[PDB]
């Protein structure tokens, strides 16, 4: 889904998916219940701010809302809402994640590492079982996948849901991905057969400013590669 | 909280029930009470609607145990399945003096996470040591569902997760752990008395 990071201070403007009636915008975070921000008018335009809530801090136009004096607290998932034309639900369309920090140098790309079978779970299970971790990478946004041959493959598959963190009780620590793959002992036997394990980063845009030394966490895609071993 | 979900996570086997408990506070005398589906890609999916005055609301394997009384409605998925996995959020519509006027906020729990557990048929759990690639982890996997895998004091122990296989018709629960190493005192605790490492 799309993936949203700004400095405190900044401005983060919010897109919305679905496509007639009150447009409503929700925020959740975790631990914490989805709460509503403010709805909007499609015909008046008339725009209605929750109890709590400071003018100015939402602004909202045809469709897409732009928020104004971001701090670390504006962080989690951003959904836009709307009520059914003739059945009486909520239905939410936006899979938007908004993550805020201080600077920008907490921002770091992922190390890739792919780890090859070992000799035991080959002649025990008959089963070859690769896995690849992500690590030392902020924000949270990212995607892993693997690849076979030039093709990614599903089956077989799995990733952690929830990616660990390396420092706890850290809000701006970097984390941790791990991801795993089985496949038949025969089939990483054999040489021929390519494994990669791709993960795709989401960074920092062309129009952000990096001004420290080392290299600009762009978005980019670092891999990693194994081969099969038959002896 | 006015709306109120006391579990936090849930654990339970392939096809069997789940009841997910939840409880609301509201002065109104009509209302809806609502509940969603929090996928791991953070898209909110609508599942079954329960009113002030209805019956108890069955839809497919979602089925709500309303009592009206002590202000409970708990969500209940009878036929469980791998990807009945996810986060649930009990939902309360409060209307207006006039009506539902399309204004209305749901007012949302804090969710309560459902993991479904995948069946082992022939299970033998081992600890394997995987040796880096590029130069220079350790992985417990093939274990039954009902044990647990626990993060280590430190040290990097990931959660437990459930691999497919297609072709095969094989399911597996993996967990690897690693740190900058013994792989037998790698997990700090959460114990099979069947193991190779």
């Known amino acids: 889904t799309k993936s949203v990071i700004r400095q405190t201070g900044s401005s983060a403007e919010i897109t919305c998916d679905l496509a007639?009636?009150?447009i409503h915008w929700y925020l959740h975070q975790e631990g914490k219940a989805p709460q509503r921000l403010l709805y909007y008018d499609s015909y008046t335009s008339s725009v209605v701010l929750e109890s709590g809530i400071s003018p100015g801090k939402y602004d909202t136009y045809g469709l897409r809302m732009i928020l104004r004096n971001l701090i670390e607290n504006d962080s989690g998932v951003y959904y836009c809402?709307?009520?059914?034309?003739?059945?009486?639900?909520?239905?939410f369309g936006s899979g938007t994640t908004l993550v805020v920090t201080e600077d920008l140098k907490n921002v770091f790309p992922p190390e890739v590492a792919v780890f090859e079978p070992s000799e035991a779970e080959i002649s025990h299970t008959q089963k070859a079982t690769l896995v690849c971790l992500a690590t030392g990478f902020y924000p949270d946004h990212v995607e892993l996948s693997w690849w076979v041959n030039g093709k990614e493959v599903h089956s077989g598959v799995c990733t952690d849901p929830q990616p660990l963190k390396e420092q706890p009780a850290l809000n701006d620590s970097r984390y941790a991905l791990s991801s795993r793959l089985r496949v038949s002992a025969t089939f990483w036997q054999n040489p021929r057969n390519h494994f990669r394990c791709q993960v795709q980063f989401y960074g920092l845009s062309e129009n952000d400013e990096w001004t420290q030394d080392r290299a600009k966490p762009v978005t980019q895609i670092v891999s990693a590669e194994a081969w099969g071993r038959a002896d | 909280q006015k709306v109120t979900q006391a579990q936090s996570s849930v654990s339970m086997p392939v096809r069997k029930a789940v009841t997910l408990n939840c409880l609301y506070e509201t002065s109104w005398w009509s209302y809806y009470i609502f509940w969603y589906k929090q996928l791991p890609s953070k898209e909110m999916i609508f599942l079954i609607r329960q009113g002030s005055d209805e019956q108890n609301a069955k839809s497919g394997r979602y089925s709500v145990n309303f009592k009206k009384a002590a202000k409970s409605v708990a969500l209940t998925i009878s036929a469980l399945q791998l990807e009945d996995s996810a986060k649930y959020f009990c939902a309360l519509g409060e209307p207006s003096y006039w009506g539902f006027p399309r204004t209305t906020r749901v007012i949302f729990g804090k969710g309560t996470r459902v993991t479904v557990e995948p069946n082992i048929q022939n299970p033998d759990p081992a600890v394997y040591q995987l040796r880096d690639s590029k130069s220079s982890v350790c992985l417990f996997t093939d274990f039954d569902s009902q044990t647990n895998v626990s993060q280590s004091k430190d040290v990097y122990i990931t959660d437990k997760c459930v691999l497919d296989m297609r072709s095969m018709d094989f399911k597996s629960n993996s967990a690897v752990a690693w740190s900058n190493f013994a792989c037998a005192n790698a997990f700090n605790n959460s114990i099979p008395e069947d193991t190779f490492f």
């Open positions: 809402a709307t009520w059914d034309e003739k059945y009486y639900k909520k239905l």
């Open positions: 007639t009636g009150y």
